[PDB]
Design a protein around this ligand. Sequence first.
Ligand code: CLA
Ligand code: CLA
Ligand code: CLA
Ligand code: CLA
Ligand code: CLA
Ligand SMILES: CC1=C(/C=C/C(C)=C/C=C/C(C)=C/C=C/C=C(C)/C=C/C=C(C)/C=C/C2=C(C)CCCC2(C)C)C(C)(C)CCC1
Ligand SMILES: CC1=C(/C=C/C(C)=C/C=C/C(C)=C/C=C/C=C(C)/C=C/C=C(C)/C=C/C2=C(C)CCCC2(C)C)C(C)(C)CCC1
Ligand SMILES: [Ca+2]
Lengths: 120, 50
Amino acid sequence: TLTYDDIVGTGLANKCPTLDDTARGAYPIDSSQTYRIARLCLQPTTFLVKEEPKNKRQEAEFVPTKLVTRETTSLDQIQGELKVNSDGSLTFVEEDGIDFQPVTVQMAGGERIPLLFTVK
Amino acid sequence: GLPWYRVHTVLINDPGRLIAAHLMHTALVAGWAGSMALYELATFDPSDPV
Ligand code: CLA
Ligand code: CLA
Ligand code: CLA
Ligand code: CLA
Ligand code: CLA
Ligand SMILES: CC1=C(/C=C/C(C)=C/C=C/C(C)=C/C=C/C=C(C)/C=C/C=C(C)/C=C/C2=C(C)CCCC2(C)C)C(C)(C)CCC1
Ligand SMILES: CC1=C(/C=C/C(C)=C/C=C/C(C)=C/C=C/C=C(C)/C=C/C=C(C)/C=C/C2=C(C)CCCC2(C)C)C(C)(C)CCC1
Ligand SMILES: [Ca+2]
């Protein structure tokens, strides 16, 4: 573990935790014991912006973009119940947390594309 | 003295100022090139090469 001071200014704070190459096991679900997610976290790596095919509809694809803002992208502290379903499936239901971050990215032309990257 | 259309004859045998002259010329032609570019970059639309 590292203290606040051990992260400040490094950019590490905008990074969701990681598991080692080992941890590739499996977690059990009692299906008779409620479960929740104590901490969901999402860290962006790429932001692609589908381009408008001009008038000539020719099918459009997503294109990479430069992150004009900085390392403020990550969503963290997400939380909610991970209820087990009748059919034996699992559904997560978020309650609260830093569930959104305003991101701004530039493109080929120079156009800034602001979005509200979220999972509310 | 010299007619207007002859003012540049003042260099016919002054290798120094003749070089000074062609240097200024080259400067203008290089200058134009640089700035004519910027004009195109400020108005050219890359949105569609087709
Ligand atoms: C082998 C030696 C040599 C070399 C390499 C040159 C080279 C050049 N001479 Mg030149 N010259 C020489 C001997 C030489 N001369 C002799 C013995 C005489 C008789 C005295 C002349 C008389 C002469 C005249 C009368 C003229 C030239 C011009 C030119 C230039 C025409 C191209 C240009 O303008 O580029 C410009 C674009 C470039 C890409 C920039 C190149 C500049 C370089 C990189 C900087 C060099 C810095 C250095 C300290 C100064 C030396 C300059 C030159 C003497 C090498 C060119 C750089 C013409 C000129 O000066 O036009 C402006 C010109 O009118 N020369
Ligand atoms: C290779 C390029 C070149 C060069 C270096 C020269 C150089 C020279 N010419 Mg000349 N000349 C050229 C091409 C060139 N000429 C061409 C193509 C023509 C036919 C159109 C002439 C016709 C010509 C005549 C009829 C005479 C000269 C004369 C002279 C000498 C005196 C210049 C003078 O004082 O003008 C003075 C210049 C001004 C005060 C007036 C310029 C106004 C111009 C017309 C308006 C346009 C300006 C604009 C920026 C030009 C754009 C350049 C364009 C090519 C991109 C000088 C040695 C004179 C000489 O022999 O004296 C005894 C002379 O009588 N030239
Ligand atoms: C390649 C460009 C060039 C160069 C290197 C020279 C170089 C020279 N000229 Mg010259 N000249 C040029 C173009 C050029 N001229 C043009 C286009 C004209 C008018 C047609 C003249 C008219 C002229 C005269 C009448 C005389 C010279 C003379 C001379 C010599 C002495 C320097 C002098 O006092 O200049 C004089 C300075 C000027 C006339 C230059 C100013 C004019 C320009 C248009 C100003 C540009 C301002 C701005 C950047 C653009 C315009 C703004 C507009 C868009 C609103 C020198 C060798 C003298 C010489 O020794 O003769 C014996 C002389 O008497 N020139
Ligand atoms: C390799 C191509 C080339 C050549 C051969 C020349 C040659 C010449 N340039 Mg030039 N120039 C070039 C490319 C070239 N340029 C480029 C790419 C640029 C950047 C746009 C310039 C910009 C430039 C400037 C700013 C000036 C010159 C001038 C001159 C002349 C100086 C010698 C002289 O005193 O003539 C005496 C003058 C002539 C005999 C006039 C020639 C008539 C031309 C060919 C026709 C165009 C003018 C026309 C009659 C009227 C149109 C006017 C317009 C403004 C509406 C010479 C004829 C200078 C000038 O001419 O001032 C005296 C000058 O000021 N050039
Ligand atoms: C540092 C050196 C340098 C370099 C690398 C460039 C590079 C470039 N310039 Mg450039 N330029 C320079 C100096 C330089 N310039 C200087 C000093 C001037 C002022 C005179 C200019 C003025 C200039 C203009 C006005 C323009 C460029 C342009 C360009 C671009 C297009 C190149 C082109 O197609 O050329 C074309 C090359 C030729 C004209 C062919 C020359 C061959 C001649 C005809 C033969 C000469 C006779 C020869 C002596 C016979 C003996 C040969 C022997 C082997 C048999 C290119 C990026 C263009 C551009 O797109 O704008 C940015 C453009 O419009 N330049
Ligand atoms: C000094 C210096 C500098 C700066 C520089 C600069 C900024 C420059 C600019 C330059 C420029 C910016 C130039 C320009 C030029 C232009 C020109 C030279 C033009 C010309 C034109 C013409 C001549 C035209 C004509 C015509 C007309 C008008 C119409 C009819 C047709 C024709 C085409 C004929 C620096 C900082 C780098 C550093 C070092 C020092
Ligand atoms: C003072 C000083 C100095 C400096 C000096 C110098 C170096 C100057 C220069 C100057 C210069 C060098 C200037 C220039 C000018 C220019 C001009 C005046 C231009 C004009 C142009 C134009 C007008 C353009 C046009 C166009 C258009 C419109 C579009 C098309 C294209 C083109 C671009 C052509 C020093 C450093 C010593 C130090 C101290 C201070
Ligand atoms: Ca667009």
